[PDB]
Paper text:
Disulfide bond proteins (DSB) are thiol-disulfide oxidoreductases found in the periplasm of Gram negative bacteria which catalyse the oxidative folding of disulfide bond containing substrate proteins. Here we investigated the DsbA enzyme from Chlamydia trachomatis, responsible for human urogenital chlamydia infections.
We solved the crystal structure of CtDsbA, which was determined to 2.7 Å resolution by using molecular replacement methods. Consistent with all structurally characterized DsbA proteins, CtDsbA comprises a thioredoxin domain into which a second helical domain is inserted. In CtDsbA, the active site motif is Cys-Ser-Ala-Cys. CtDsbA’s dipeptide sequence is notable in that it lacks a Pro at X1 and has a non-polar aliphatic residue (Ala) at X2. Notably CtDsbA has a second disulfide bridge formed between Cys 84 (H2) and Cys 145 (H5) stapling this helical bundle. In CtDsbA, Cys 70 is positioned at the C-terminus of the B3 strand, and directed towards Ser 75 and Met 76 of the adjacent H2; as the side chain of Cys 70 is relatively buried in comparison to Cys 38 it is unlikely to play a role in interaction with substrate or redox partner proteins unless this loop undergoes a significant conformational change during the catalytic cycle. CtDsbA is strikingly charged near its active site with a pronounced patch of negative potential in this region.
Author numbering: 3 to 109, 114 to 132, 135 to 203
The structure:
């Protein structure tokens, strides 16, 4: 009830939209924009492989951070965080990511609640996601200030390289990442760990 203020921006993966083991030695942190054209191939062909090869093995933690840089994306950005927080008790990144993926693979005035609500249907949650609640949360623009933290966070992280998709493996920064690039960097990280 009465506690100190929350951090402006968290210090551990546990408190970011993350799947896998939060204590894991390696952390993959990905930044994506709801409208980025280069992210469609990534979330569809690259992101799952990251999950399968490094996250499902307990080798890495996978964080996905949303950002809003081009007009028409804020509604979708709102919906993402609206779904991420569909349950007051527990944030479920699993629903939030699958929702994201569905948005990235969707074909400038595109982001409408109806389209955002339809994509949100049948979404797997740990006690279900309602359209009317989702539409209300989008119009409310609850998470405008949050997305500003994300933009500034991802910016300061990339030294201004505000382009997506951008994945961060350990302390390494890979623009327009591929699976080979990500794997090649992990091979180095496993090697340094071995040292």
């Amino acid at each position: 009830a009465i506690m100190p203020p929350k951090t402006h921006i968290p210090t551990t993966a546990k408190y970011f939209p993350t799947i896998g083991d939060p204590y894991a030695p390696i952390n993959i942190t990905v930044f994506e924009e709801p409208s980025c054209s280069a992210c469609e191939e990534f979330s569809s062909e690259v992101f799952p492989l990251i999950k399968k090869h490094f996250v499902d093995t307990g080798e890495a933690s996978l964080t996905l951070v949303p950002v809003c840089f081009i007009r028409g994306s804020m509604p979708a950005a709102q919906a993402l965080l609206c779904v991420y927080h569909h349950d007051p008790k527990r944030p479920d990144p699993e629903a939030y990511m699958e929702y994201f993926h569905r948005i990235l693979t969707y074909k400038s005035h595109w982001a409408t609640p109806e389209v955002l609500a339809k994509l949100a249907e049948k979404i797997p949650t740990h006690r279900e996601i309602n359209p009317k609640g989702l539409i209300q949360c989008i119009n409310s623009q609850r998470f405008t200030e949050q997305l500003k933290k994300n933009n500034i966070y991802g910016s300061q992280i990339m030294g201004g390289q505000l382009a997506t998709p951008t994945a961060v493996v350990g302390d390494y920064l890979i623009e327009d990442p591929t699976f080979d690039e990500i794997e090649r960097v992990i091979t180095q990280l496993r090697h340094l760990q071995a040292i």
